[PDB]
Amino acid sequence: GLSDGEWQQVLNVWGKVEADIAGHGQEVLIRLFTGHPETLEKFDKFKHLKTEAEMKASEDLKKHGTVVLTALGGILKKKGHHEAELKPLAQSHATKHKIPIKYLEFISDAIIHVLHSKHPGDFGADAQGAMTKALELFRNDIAAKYKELGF
């Protein structure tokens, strides 16, 4: 449970994302891919990319970053009331793409990193705390369904 002041910081921060969704999207995935190359393996569409340069040039990659950040963006605006928006994602990532929870943690760290990088000194210590908390709630709720499903 984030406090109400906390959600407000989450959603204010995410305003910054929404002004350039595709740009943040791409950098998040890029940071994820170059930081944890095994994650590349989950994407047949992306397993071809070797170089950061290749990633940056890929318009598909930007597309997919937009998908991933709109989804998350939609979840966060539910302020924790995300059960329905969540079962789909959990059930598919666990038996289909077989995404370890670890990867959810990788992409969370990567959103944080991207935000500091795009917004140095506009991403305060409380906002950081709030965004981390939000990203933890989500992960923990996916983690619950994953246990249920035995992943």
UniProtKB/Swiss-Prot annotation:
Its main location: cytoplasm. O2 binds at H64. Nitrite binds at H64. The keyword Oxidoreductase applies. It catalyses: Fe(III)-heme b-[protein] + nitric oxide + H2O = Fe(II)-heme b-[protein] + nitrite + 2 H(+); H2O2 + AH2 = A + 2 H2O. InterPro entries: Globin, Globin-like_sf, Myoglobin. The keyword Transport applies. It is found in: Cytoplasm, Sarcoplasm. The modification Phosphoserine is found at S3. Keywords: Cytoplasm, Heme, Iron, Metal-binding, Muscle protein, Oxidoreductase, Oxygen transport, Phosphoprotein, Transport. Residues 1-147 form the Globin domain. One of its GO terms (biological process) is oxygen transport. This is Myoglobin. It comes from Equus caballus. The lineage of its organism: Eukaryota, Metazoa, Chordata, Craniata, Vertebrata. The gene is MB.
